[PDB]
């Protein structure tokens, strides 16, 4: 059946220029430098024996359809037609699935030495299709009190973070009323970054970003493969179980045994420990995958706490904390270098029952 | 000056939506008139004085080069041209190419019928837990599945001040056995008399097992999976499923326990601590991992491994089977779906009790 | 005096809408008087504390009273009133996004055939009121009754079908605060079916009824019009079945009521001049509900027995009638409608309540 | 026939730099983070009689700098109104234009009445959607000079399960009010301070609104708001005088004491004695019970004053609990509850309509000291 040139344009657009029965790109001639004969390379016909009910078919598939004198089909195709348009519509609207909340969490120290502006995260976000729609959240961990970073302090940190987060996640939108994605970067001490991960978890639409010394908030290399994560099991024994992460750098054994005498060391590392190893986000996912496989191995060995000494990039420390948010909880005692005690590893954070 | 033919192509290959915000540029939904209110924007400008303009660029080349032309809404167009540094050529080119490819994939995906989208999530975690609706619909579409609406999304009430107490599990049961059945009954007709069910869950393990039991009679059940790295996308369609190793239970008269060590190794100490004298049968994989649900074949291999073992274990004793599971959420659903009718023993589901220092304690009873 | 970048002047002037943050005076008076603006003379930018989001816009009078330092920075801290001032402007400027809405047209098979309502007609009327759809409008028709007629199962399926569609109202949240969108609904069907539409949507959400008007289509005939008095005659004391007659679009002949409900004790709500055209604006619908609910409370106090409804009311009022009867409290209402295959005699077609 | 730069700068100032038709912020690009003026000054009536909304009798020369003829629009809204002149007629646009400008002025001229925590509490026990928009509460607050550091707390009760409003249901209600709400107010603690004000609107089970008010009644500077079928969160009529609150006292005797509240509607006394045999009935009513009677906050305060007096009177008349049978608007249920925090410590048993028992009154929550 015949159509005007205006209807042709509408049907061609709503189908993205593919045959609805076979999927062939009917703009091929244009791609091969030739002139586009819209009327020749495609036929339009009703889906059932309004531009919404008109299909775009290639000549081949069209000739296979039984039609009556007026060009209408004999068999109903509205099912496959509406389903086709729905698939195109879902792909065409995909950018509105990038609504996102910018979150920059820094210690008061790095907020001074190395402040991360919102513009820098928004540019990295924008490049990945994540679209902020309001002011980015920028917050700094509470300056500790007289009792130090004890339980009440860390519980307040978590309440604070989860409060600001939950208020922004109310900003539902897009095609389906989904909460926005969380785009989070962290630049603080390793225990605080772990509590940031305790706060956000890993069971929502959330994308970690990484502050890189060279490339800043842009990913150094999207193509890089993640390094292999090498595991050294602990020696048999009775001493305290110590998990050593040598990722940014090699942790000296002496520093661990000094802080934790008798420690039996289990170690996760990479071939060349380096500060620049977070080449892309897959590296962070690969780290968590390897870590969790080994944490399960270690937890099957002992019901006793695991003492963590970590030289890890900031992004990895967040994912670590986020990993340990299942219902199941094993006790993890996190150690960090006390800059006021000759950089001695001292216990700073407890996670678990 | 882009010619008329190329502008049409741009409108065609983008399906008439803005490539940066996804809004529909073929229609004004406020007042209801079909209208083309989008703009064919140049990434590299015609003249070198424009935004992203550079000296080494033959402008006569890319004036009709669709790789350099984006369909944008007027607002997104104005924004990129007023902040060239914020929207560099390379970022716009990637976004431009990623957008066009998503439309190609959808146009070339063969039709696979209709299905009701069903998301089931809990609030028993100490963090947000929220499965995006778009990501389920997108996973469905990648397999040719569509729906007449965005589907059903059930969020369990959160634990009250007493943790996961009797009230809580009563709310869970009502959510799965009443609320869900109501939501599906309201779709009856629109989808027909026996519609396919595209289900994904991230909730308490015993709740997901109950969910699988209640939907296990339904044919055309397509389980999807939330994955920490890939969200609802299958991590690797070509991945080979892991082998499932079964340790049969020792002989005796103690209580029979089925331990599933898939996401992690369940410490045997925790099982006997909760069920002294337990005769432990175990299903496990060589490298227990949260990441293991690489594709639906993995899920199907899990149920095939376990269909048989449930029959063997049930043919040993008449008493209840105590379940201790560290398993991914999709396999918790699949496990419950085996209890629907294939296996009508009584199964007592233990779970980690945060009120008891992570000890295993009994929760739901799944009987016939 | 704080030195202004000339461009920071336009940022601050814009974010405050050109009023003094202390006295509320509109500082664009000279432009209103046909003269050129002196943006640096009619107002003094001043940081709120002793980025451009921390700069207030005072007038000269208020600026002096704010004892400044040499360069301008104030003495007392006005950071709270400033941020509260900006919050109030942002609330008002973003108010158009409070109009996000779902269009819903609901018709019977018959009226969809003789008097179809296209989405375009509802959308234009919504737009005039600041209600803006963001997706295709819902347009549905009540299913045709099966062999059992319109029995309880039929009507529950009507309700399920409507409330399934309304899941868009619940879920497609958006805007500045994540609110569910408004529902904009118009119905044109038999009165029993329209009452079930009202039963489905309720009256406890942001929801705006529209009315199809013979002359004015979906546009309101007269926004100024005063709602009519809803006149009420109580029923005669007695034991007969209590009948509520609504003579709004037309006078309902009492003989048709008693013919169908022998011994009917008639209570009547009407207007002085029953008219098809009486729905002149939305306030008329609200006024009808208010008067209706006052009288239903009176009638339910008179008797525990069911109330038999014989309504001659515009379609929009029938929706609101059904929406009113969605509290936890339920009294039994038996809705009667004229059956064409029985000489247009009133016949019981719907039961609401326990 | 071009608009000059001064007029455009006024248009930008008038509107606070937002699109008058969709409310998007036109002074900033939140995606990439750069301040930028990405808005347009759109003419309602065009200079040429052939343009969109063009009229032959329009003096184009005398309106190109008429700000009543100019709207600040985002680029998309401007494109749409010029391609569908029939869908966006001048009357419609002028009306929306003036409405937009007025709300700006009101905000700019409203005095600072301080800060308050927005609190919305709604149930799901109705057979319809039940949803109080956050924007409407925030706009009610702003109209009285109240702002908030964020959009506040919104609590939605779990819906009833297959057995109706049973023991599990009322336990969930108790957890929502006494635990979930309390946890969120604490967590908010810090942004607001020690003793912040609560701007509260409720639309939930009568017994749950009463529990709510009792729970929050300690807190000073509570600002009650009301959801209204016609006016939503707007007050129907600030000038309306409160109605008379008629009270009839109970008869003497040893039977259980019942307080019937006929405000929203007349509570039939036959239903009270059906549920509570031998009831001695006291009734507080208004001359014309109506769902719409909450015309302004003074109506709410007059109900509170009247009821305070009668609770004192009734509490000196029975040793057993006072049984409440209430057909009252949601805001008055909250204020009733707030009288039970400390001023009235007798035990109150709240009855409510039971849709599983054919609309009979049934006992629900017990409220006490
Ligand atoms: N033997 C050993 N040798 C070297 N380091 C060792 C160690 N034993 C322990 N460590 C500690 O392991 C962490 C590795 O350093 P990193 O940079 O890879 O990751 C850090 C970390 O995640 C967090 C807190 O920093 P810090 O407290 O210095 O902890 C350091 C370091 O002291 O912030 C990250 N971070 C700091 N500054 C950054 C910057 N400029 N850019 C990007 N990320 C930056
Ligand atoms: N000794 C032991 N060691 C480790 N775990 C042990 C254990 N003994 C029991 N367990 C339990 O095994 C489950 C493993 O986690 P999982 O992710 O593989 O599977 C979960 C599960 O299917 C369901 C409920 O979660 P939870 O109650 O935390 O159960 C946990 C844990 O408590 O949701 C899944 N789920 C959680 N978070 C998810 C996320 N972010 N993305 C995708 N799915 C996610
Ligand atoms: N002379 C008379 N004496 C006594 N009772 C008379 C009567 N004449 C009509 N009645 C009865 O009074 C009900 C109200 O009539 P109405 O038109 O004011 O409202 C109707 C109603 O709400 C619903 C179903 O229509 P119907 O079944 O005819 O109901 C009539 C009829 O039972 O649709 C509305 N509706 C119909 N057509 C419409 C249109 N074209 N435009 C807008 N709304 C239209
Ligand atoms: N004989 C009798 N006759 C009439 N009612 C009777 C009765 N015996 C008891 N009652 C009860 O008196 C309350 C009157 O209704 P109301 O609106 O005046 O007050 C309600 C109430 O405060 C709370 C819970 O509602 P509900 O449980 O339905 O209680 C109803 C009703 O069952 O929410 C308010 N509320 C409901 N819907 C609302 C809306 N749409 N807009 C604004 N507020 C709304
Ligand atoms: Mg351009
Ligand atoms: Mg334009
Ligand atoms: Mg432009
Ligand atoms: Mg214009
Ligand atoms: Zn084909
Ligand atoms: Zn756009
Ligand atoms: Zn002033
Ligand atoms: Zn706009």
mmCIF file of N, CA and C in Angstrom, chain C residues 262-336:
data_model
loop_
_atom_site.group_PDB
_atom_site.id
_atom_site.type_symbol
_atom_site.label_atom_id
_atom_site.label_comp_id
_atom_site.label_asym_id
_atom_site.label_seq_id
_atom_site.Cartn_x
_atom_site.Cartn_y
_atom_site.Cartn_z
ATOM 1 N N UNK C 262 -39.847 -0.843 44.403
ATOM 2 C CA UNK C 262 -41.142 -0.604 45.058
ATOM 3 C C UNK C 262 -40.986 -0.232 46.526
ATOM 4 N N UNK C 263 -41.748 0.777 46.944
ATOM 5 C CA UNK C 263 -41.669 1.285 48.299
ATOM 6 C C UNK C 263 -40.492 2.193 48.570
ATOM 7 N N UNK C 264 -39.814 2.668 47.530
ATOM 8 C CA UNK C 264 -38.611 3.464 47.715
ATOM 9 C C UNK C 264 -38.892 4.716 48.532
ATOM 10 N N UNK C 265 -38.091 4.924 49.571
ATOM 11 C CA UNK C 265 -38.066 6.189 50.299
ATOM 12 C C UNK C 265 -36.999 7.061 49.648
ATOM 13 N N UNK C 266 -37.428 8.103 48.949
ATOM 14 C CA UNK C 266 -36.534 8.858 48.081
ATOM 15 C C UNK C 266 -35.949 10.037 48.848
ATOM 16 N N UNK C 267 -34.626 10.051 48.953
ATOM 17 C CA UNK C 267 -33.847 11.232 49.294
ATOM 18 C C UNK C 267 -33.271 11.766 47.990
ATOM 19 N N UNK C 268 -33.307 13.083 47.801
ATOM 20 C CA UNK C 268 -32.927 13.651 46.513
ATOM 21 C C UNK C 268 -31.917 14.773 46.682
ATOM 22 N N UNK C 269 -30.785 14.651 45.993
ATOM 23 C CA UNK C 269 -29.818 15.728 45.824
ATOM 24 C C UNK C 269 -29.890 16.211 44.382
ATOM 25 N N UNK C 270 -30.093 17.510 44.192
ATOM 26 C CA UNK C 270 -30.235 18.078 42.861
ATOM 27 C C UNK C 270 -29.608 19.464 42.838
ATOM 28 N N UNK C 271 -29.711 20.126 41.693
ATOM 29 C CA UNK C 271 -29.388 21.548 41.587
ATOM 30 C C UNK C 271 -30.633 22.260 41.083
ATOM 31 N N UNK C 272 -30.722 23.574 41.299
ATOM 32 C CA UNK C 272 -31.938 24.302 40.897
ATOM 33 C C UNK C 272 -32.275 24.173 39.425
ATOM 34 N N UNK C 273 -31.274 24.052 38.556
ATOM 35 C CA UNK C 273 -31.485 23.992 37.111
ATOM 36 C C UNK C 273 -30.638 22.869 36.536
ATOM 37 N N UNK C 274 -31.104 21.628 36.660
ATOM 38 C CA UNK C 274 -30.337 20.496 36.127
ATOM 39 C C UNK C 274 -29.970 20.732 34.668
ATOM 40 N N UNK C 275 -28.716 20.419 34.335
ATOM 41 C CA UNK C 275 -28.147 20.781 33.042
ATOM 42 C C UNK C 275 -27.010 19.833 32.689
ATOM 43 N N UNK C 276 -26.988 19.406 31.418
ATOM 44 C CA UNK C 276 -25.857 18.644 30.901
ATOM 45 C C UNK C 276 -24.554 19.429 31.021
ATOM 46 N N UNK C 277 -24.634 20.755 30.959
ATOM 47 C CA UNK C 277 -23.465 21.613 30.873
ATOM 48 C C UNK C 277 -22.956 22.091 32.228
ATOM 49 N N UNK C 278 -23.493 21.567 33.334
ATOM 50 C CA UNK C 278 -23.256 22.188 34.633
ATOM 51 C C UNK C 278 -21.807 22.092 35.108
ATOM 52 N N UNK C 279 -20.998 21.184 34.570
ATOM 53 C CA UNK C 279 -19.622 21.091 35.054
ATOM 54 C C UNK C 279 -18.812 22.218 34.415
ATOM 55 N N UNK C 280 -18.856 23.404 35.029
ATOM 56 C CA UNK C 280 -18.228 24.582 34.440
ATOM 57 C C UNK C 280 -16.742 24.680 34.763
ATOM 58 N N UNK C 281 -16.315 24.105 35.880
ATOM 59 C CA UNK C 281 -14.905 24.065 36.239
ATOM 60 C C UNK C 281 -14.725 22.958 37.263
ATOM 61 N N UNK C 282 -13.466 22.694 37.613
ATOM 62 C CA UNK C 282 -13.186 21.606 38.538
ATOM 63 C C UNK C 282 -13.770 21.876 39.917
ATOM 64 N N UNK C 283 -13.891 23.149 40.310
ATOM 65 C CA UNK C 283 -14.467 23.444 41.618
ATOM 66 C C UNK C 283 -15.899 22.932 41.722
ATOM 67 N N UNK C 284 -16.602 22.803 40.592
ATOM 68 C CA UNK C 284 -17.954 22.258 40.633
ATOM 69 C C UNK C 284 -17.925 20.793 41.049
ATOM 70 N N UNK C 285 -16.907 20.054 40.601
ATOM 71 C CA UNK C 285 -16.783 18.652 40.980
ATOM 72 C C UNK C 285 -16.494 18.541 42.472
ATOM 73 N N UNK C 286 -15.539 19.342 42.959
ATOM 74 C CA UNK C 286 -15.218 19.328 44.379
ATOM 75 C C UNK C 286 -16.421 19.717 45.225
ATOM 76 N N UNK C 287 -17.181 20.713 44.771
ATOM 77 C CA UNK C 287 -18.337 21.167 45.534
ATOM 78 C C UNK C 287 -19.415 20.093 45.577
ATOM 79 N N UNK C 288 -19.563 19.329 44.489
ATOM 80 C CA UNK C 288 -20.526 18.234 44.466
ATOM 81 C C UNK C 288 -20.138 17.142 45.451
ATOM 82 N N UNK C 289 -18.848 16.807 45.511
ATOM 83 C CA UNK C 289 -18.401 15.807 46.471
ATOM 84 C C UNK C 289 -18.654 16.275 47.900
ATOM 85 N N UNK C 290 -18.286 17.523 48.208
ATOM 86 C CA UNK C 290 -18.460 18.027 49.568
ATOM 87 C C UNK C 290 -19.921 17.921 49.999
ATOM 88 N N UNK C 291 -20.844 18.342 49.125
ATOM 89 C CA UNK C 291 -22.261 18.272 49.460
ATOM 90 C C UNK C 291 -22.735 16.826 49.520
ATOM 91 N N UNK C 292 -22.299 16.009 48.560
ATOM 92 C CA UNK C 292 -22.620 14.587 48.585
ATOM 93 C C UNK C 292 -22.172 13.941 49.889
ATOM 94 N N UNK C 293 -20.919 14.151 50.285
ATOM 95 C CA UNK C 293 -20.450 13.443 51.470
ATOM 96 C C UNK C 293 -21.190 13.910 52.722
ATOM 97 N N UNK C 294 -21.503 15.206 52.816
ATOM 98 C CA UNK C 294 -22.307 15.688 53.937
ATOM 99 C C UNK C 294 -23.620 14.918 54.029
ATOM 100 N N UNK C 295 -24.280 14.703 52.886
ATOM 101 C CA UNK C 295 -25.596 14.078 52.884
ATOM 102 C C UNK C 295 -25.528 12.564 53.042
ATOM 103 N N UNK C 296 -24.489 11.929 52.495
ATOM 104 C CA UNK C 296 -24.320 10.493 52.691
ATOM 105 C C UNK C 296 -24.108 10.174 54.165
ATOM 106 N N UNK C 297 -23.313 10.998 54.859
ATOM 107 C CA UNK C 297 -23.165 10.849 56.301
ATOM 108 C C UNK C 297 -24.510 10.962 57.005
ATOM 109 N N UNK C 298 -25.354 11.887 56.551
ATOM 110 C CA UNK C 298 -26.681 12.025 57.137
ATOM 111 C C UNK C 298 -27.534 10.790 56.876
ATOM 112 N N UNK C 299 -27.492 10.257 55.652
ATOM 113 C CA UNK C 299 -28.355 9.133 55.300
ATOM 114 C C UNK C 299 -27.898 7.845 55.974
ATOM 115 N N UNK C 300 -26.581 7.627 56.050
ATOM 116 C CA UNK C 300 -26.065 6.446 56.734
ATOM 117 C C UNK C 300 -26.369 6.492 58.224
ATOM 118 N N UNK C 301 -26.425 7.691 58.811
ATOM 119 C CA UNK C 301 -26.876 7.796 60.191
ATOM 120 C C UNK C 301 -28.341 7.403 60.314
ATOM 121 N N UNK C 302 -29.138 7.654 59.274
ATOM 122 C CA UNK C 302 -30.556 7.349 59.362
ATOM 123 C C UNK C 302 -30.829 5.849 59.356
ATOM 124 N N UNK C 303 -29.955 5.045 58.748
ATOM 125 C CA UNK C 303 -30.273 3.635 58.566
ATOM 126 C C UNK C 303 -29.000 2.838 58.355
ATOM 127 N N UNK C 304 -28.949 1.593 58.841
ATOM 128 C CA UNK C 304 -27.833 0.706 58.479
ATOM 129 C C UNK C 304 -27.996 0.044 57.121
ATOM 130 N N UNK C 305 -29.145 0.195 56.478
ATOM 131 C CA UNK C 305 -29.466 -0.569 55.287
ATOM 132 C C UNK C 305 -28.858 0.046 54.034
ATOM 133 N N UNK C 306 -28.733 -0.742 52.966
ATOM 134 C CA UNK C 306 -28.084 -0.227 51.757
ATOM 135 C C UNK C 306 -28.784 1.010 51.215
ATOM 136 N N UNK C 307 -28.004 1.842 50.543
ATOM 137 C CA UNK C 307 -28.516 3.019 49.852
ATOM 138 C C UNK C 307 -28.560 2.689 48.369
ATOM 139 N N UNK C 308 -29.723 2.913 47.755
ATOM 140 C CA UNK C 308 -29.966 2.589 46.353
ATOM 141 C C UNK C 308 -29.831 3.866 45.533
ATOM 142 N N UNK C 309 -28.836 3.902 44.649
ATOM 143 C CA UNK C 309 -28.455 5.110 43.924
ATOM 144 C C UNK C 309 -29.121 5.124 42.558
ATOM 145 N N UNK C 310 -29.747 6.254 42.222
ATOM 146 C CA UNK C 310 -30.375 6.500 40.919
ATOM 147 C C UNK C 310 -29.837 7.849 40.451
ATOM 148 N N UNK C 311 -28.762 7.840 39.673
ATOM 149 C CA UNK C 311 -28.018 9.056 39.379
ATOM 150 C C UNK C 311 -28.253 9.520 37.953
ATOM 151 N N UNK C 312 -28.511 10.816 37.799
ATOM 152 C CA UNK C 312 -28.471 11.503 36.511
ATOM 153 C C UNK C 312 -27.411 12.595 36.671
ATOM 154 N N UNK C 313 -26.147 12.229 36.482
ATOM 155 C CA UNK C 313 -25.042 13.133 36.791
ATOM 156 C C UNK C 313 -24.039 13.154 35.646
ATOM 157 N N UNK C 314 -23.366 14.279 35.401
ATOM 158 C CA UNK C 314 -22.294 14.285 34.399
ATOM 159 C C UNK C 314 -21.237 13.245 34.734
ATOM 160 N N UNK C 315 -20.494 12.850 33.704
ATOM 161 C CA UNK C 315 -19.544 11.756 33.873
ATOM 162 C C UNK C 315 -18.478 12.099 34.906
ATOM 163 N N UNK C 316 -18.009 13.346 34.918
ATOM 164 C CA UNK C 316 -16.959 13.717 35.861
ATOM 165 C C UNK C 316 -17.432 13.568 37.305
ATOM 166 N N UNK C 317 -18.701 13.882 37.575
ATOM 167 C CA UNK C 317 -19.216 13.730 38.933
ATOM 168 C C UNK C 317 -19.351 12.266 39.332
ATOM 169 N N UNK C 318 -19.608 11.383 38.362
ATOM 170 C CA UNK C 318 -19.690 9.957 38.658
ATOM 171 C C UNK C 318 -18.329 9.394 39.054
ATOM 172 N N UNK C 319 -17.252 9.876 38.427
ATOM 173 C CA UNK C 319 -15.920 9.455 38.849
ATOM 174 C C UNK C 319 -15.674 9.871 40.293
ATOM 175 N N UNK C 320 -15.972 11.129 40.615
ATOM 176 C CA UNK C 320 -15.688 11.621 41.958
ATOM 177 C C UNK C 320 -16.538 10.896 42.996
ATOM 178 N N UNK C 321 -17.800 10.611 42.663
ATOM 179 C CA UNK C 321 -18.645 9.791 43.530
ATOM 180 C C UNK C 321 -17.940 8.492 43.903
ATOM 181 N N UNK C 322 -17.435 7.766 42.904
ATOM 182 C CA UNK C 322 -16.751 6.514 43.186
ATOM 183 C C UNK C 322 -15.478 6.698 43.993
ATOM 184 N N UNK C 323 -14.728 7.770 43.715
ATOM 185 C CA UNK C 323 -13.506 8.033 44.465
ATOM 186 C C UNK C 323 -13.790 8.368 45.925
ATOM 187 N N UNK C 324 -14.931 9.006 46.207
ATOM 188 C CA UNK C 324 -15.265 9.363 47.583
ATOM 189 C C UNK C 324 -15.425 8.124 48.454
ATOM 190 N N UNK C 325 -15.980 7.057 47.891
ATOM 191 C CA UNK C 325 -16.297 5.847 48.646
ATOM 192 C C UNK C 325 -15.130 4.865 48.666
ATOM 193 N N UNK C 326 -13.937 5.376 49.007
ATOM 194 C CA UNK C 326 -12.721 4.570 49.074
ATOM 195 C C UNK C 326 -12.011 4.711 50.418
ATOM 196 N N UNK C 327 -12.695 5.229 51.437
ATOM 197 C CA UNK C 327 -12.164 5.199 52.789
ATOM 198 C C UNK C 327 -12.154 3.760 53.309
ATOM 199 N N UNK C 328 -11.503 3.560 54.457
ATOM 200 C CA UNK C 328 -11.632 2.281 55.151
ATOM 201 C C UNK C 328 -13.095 1.993 55.482
ATOM 202 N N UNK C 329 -13.830 3.013 55.927
ATOM 203 C CA UNK C 329 -15.262 2.864 56.167
ATOM 204 C C UNK C 329 -15.991 2.601 54.862
ATOM 205 N N UNK C 330 -16.858 1.597 54.867
ATOM 206 C CA UNK C 330 -17.664 1.265 53.703
ATOM 207 C C UNK C 330 -19.092 1.021 54.155
ATOM 208 N N UNK C 331 -20.025 1.662 53.467
ATOM 209 C CA UNK C 331 -21.453 1.416 53.575
ATOM 210 C C UNK C 331 -21.893 0.853 52.234
ATOM 211 N N UNK C 332 -22.939 0.041 52.246
ATOM 212 C CA UNK C 332 -23.365 -0.622 51.023
ATOM 213 C C UNK C 332 -24.175 0.333 50.158
ATOM 214 N N UNK C 333 -23.721 0.523 48.919
ATOM 215 C CA UNK C 333 -24.419 1.300 47.904
ATOM 216 C C UNK C 333 -24.724 0.376 46.736
ATOM 217 N N UNK C 334 -25.972 0.390 46.288
ATOM 218 C CA UNK C 334 -26.426 -0.410 45.159
ATOM 219 C C UNK C 334 -26.735 0.566 44.035
ATOM 220 N N UNK C 335 -25.902 0.560 42.995
ATOM 221 C CA UNK C 335 -26.016 1.532 41.917
ATOM 222 C C UNK C 335 -26.941 0.980 40.840
ATOM 223 N N UNK C 336 -27.932 1.778 40.455
ATOM 224 C CA UNK C 336 -28.908 1.422 39.434
ATOM 225 C C UNK C 336 -28.635 2.235 38.175
#
